[PDB]
């Protein structure tokens, strides 16, 4: 059981490295979709001032 728990814990550490490699993609992909709304928000700087 100690040989199995320690086998699972490096597998648990293997999925931790699997975890943040997806999360570091999600921060990037959120930005371009947010950047789609910056240029939408920057239009309202001129349209409302008209």
């Amino acid at each position: 059981l100690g040989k199995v728990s320690d086998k699972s814990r490096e597998i648990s550490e293997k999925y931790i490295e699997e975890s943040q490699a997806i999360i570091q993609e999600l921060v990037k992909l959120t930005m371009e979709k947010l950047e789609s709304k910056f240029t939408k928000l920057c239009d309202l700087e001129t349209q409302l001032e008209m």
Binding site: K3, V4, D6, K7
Partner: peptide, 26 residues
Amino acid sequence: SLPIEDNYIREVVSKLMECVNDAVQT
């Protein structure tokens, strides 16, 4: 060509070691 009795016709008629060797190490 004589018929035969019906109760006579009814009368005539690696995967282990792949898991064990993995179970001894961990």
